[PDB]
Design a binder for this molecule. Structure first.
Ligand SMILES: CC(=O)c1cccc(-c2cnc3ccc(NC4CCOCC4)nn23)c1
Ligand SMILES: CC(=O)c1cccc(-c2cnc3ccc(NC4CCOCC4)nn23)c1
Lengths: 297, 297
């Protein structure tokens, strides 16, 4: 197997998600995600999607292999992918500021990845429609060309127009609380309608757009990197913390005043507000966001 | 993946277990087991054992690969193994009779496979101790050399003396009811003691020994192939059918009178009775059965 032939060179992250490593396979860099022992169902789902669907796309993390291997005399589940030295968008945004071109390249590349996930393609080229369900800056990697790619399909849900069947999987994991849409926090989400899940991804995308826009220079100024809702919830916020903020108070991230002095940031602000309607049906689609971002400059 | 490159040539079985096919990979025969959609946890467990443990042995079905693939626009889980044209011991016993040498070759090869599963080996050659939990004539394949190999590790349980930890997995499937030991049917089995599981395998092995011995010629005569307990339970017997028979009535398969006129079959009868003690602790071990079968001729 690929696992047996990989040399783990450097651990680049460790947390509740397991571990992510830079390794080498046939002397080339690869990324290796080793899952926590509580998260076999996420490994199973990504393995399923990447093996059963045609998911090659510039803005979706490129898959190499998935294996089981033995380490410390116990089973490890490995996902092996392309390695992106620039790391996560979350960490990257904290280390640099962006000009207008770099900002728009990033957010467009993300909407193009998401739109590709969200659409069903037919023919032998095809793929089912896929919703992500845990989109966030930490699940987006930055490439040397300045575009991003979307990772972590362990919560993905799929839909096929042939059978009109929705495939939700059977994973007890839930999305990152900070980025959960009100209808998830409320538990009023229509779990039988595929559109519901795409709408959850759009909310989260709105939040990511906000995170990126803060780091775009206008009039030589920027905001410091902050996570969504940083001013109203603690670190590692609870369901209840988020529900109070999002459902009861109905808060949204504040737009800095300075965005209204810049035409790109005014457009981006309008875009993010249309991702955050409390009413899931009113939110923009990923395709419409992508067309609008193709038009901003 | 191996799956994408395999040509399914002929389905050799279909049932509650999924499907088993003869296929070709790189122009050689292989077996492909496609799991039922309700049985992902068995696929996961076999994949785990065969990937994480060093399980190569003449009397254990030889593993090639495990994959996920898309067919009829849905996910299939494939186990790919060596192909054994002679098929299952269950079907084979119905199509031929055995002389003394062939009978003993079969039953010894099975006890040697089981003993290898049951023992922990240390060093870099090693493997944990493994109990099977669904041993039966249908889960044993016959090789052209007349020896058998043991298949279907989807219910396997493992133990390591290092950590003294028992790994039971998380599979809702239970063994074949007809072959369940009284302590399983009773629900008095000590689920925390590894020895309990080996003892369940020994009971089942006793039953398989009975099935094989019926087909060995002595004085030019044989019994017809019958499954264990054929005279007391229906096809597809229930837990309750089996419990009444095994726990309350305390029945055991009857030994044909003719076995007591033959010294091999008298030995084999003694061996099987020592596999069937109601008291799990009194039953022989797989290693002791193997040494005794090495001595019978
Ligand atoms: C985000 C996800 O699920 C996933 C899965 C597999 C590989 C990768 C991957 C590819 N190339 C790189 C480079 C650095 C890196 N480090 C951080 C560690 C903590 O935050 C998340 C990523 N990851 N990563 C990411
Ligand atoms: C018994 C198990 O679990 C398993 C798994 C994978 C491959 C094989 C395997 C290998 N070579 C062959 C030849 C014939 C065959 N046919 C029958 C069909 C119905 O009864 C069981 C086996 N199977 N099989 C067996």
């Amino acid at each position: 197997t690929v696992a047996r032939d990989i040399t783990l060179l450097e651990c680049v992250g460790k947390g509740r998600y397991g571990e992510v490593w830079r390794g080498s396979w046939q002397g080339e860099n690869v990324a290796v995600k080793i899952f926590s022992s509580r998260d076999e169902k996420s490994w199973f789902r990504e393995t399923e999607l990447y093996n059963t669907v045609m998911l090659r796309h510039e803005n979706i993390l490129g898959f190499i292999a998935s294996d089981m291997t033995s380490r410390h005399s116990s089973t490890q589940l490995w996902l092996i992918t392309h390695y992106h030295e620039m790391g996560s968008l979350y960490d990257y945004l904290q280390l640099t500021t962006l000009d207008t071109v770099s900002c728009l390249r990033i957010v467009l590349s993300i909407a193009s990845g998401l739109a590709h996930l969200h659409i069903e393609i037919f023919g032998t080229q095809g793929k089912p429609a896929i919703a992500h369900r845990d989109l966030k800056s930490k699940n987006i990697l930055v490439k040397k060309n300045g575009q991003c790619c979307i990772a972590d399909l362990g919560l993905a849900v799929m839909h096929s127009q042939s059978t009109n069947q929705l495939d939700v999987g059977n994973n007890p994991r839930v999305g990152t609380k900070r980025y959960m849409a009100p209808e998830v926090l409320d538990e009023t989400i229509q779990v039988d309608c595929f559109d519901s899940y795409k709408r959850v991804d759009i909310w989260a995308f709105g939040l990511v757009l906000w995170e990126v826009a803060r780091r775009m220079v206008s009039n030589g100024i920027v905001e410091d990197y902050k996570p969504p809702f940083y001013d109203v919830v603690p670190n590692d916020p609870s369901f209840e913390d988020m529900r109070k903020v999002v459902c009861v108070d109905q808060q949204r991230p504040n737009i800095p005043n300075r965005w209204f002095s810049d035409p790109t940031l005014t457009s981006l602000a309008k875009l993010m507000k249309e991702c955050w309607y409390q009413n899931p049906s009113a939110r923009l689609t990923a395709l419409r966001i992508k067309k609008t971002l193709t038009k901003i400059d």
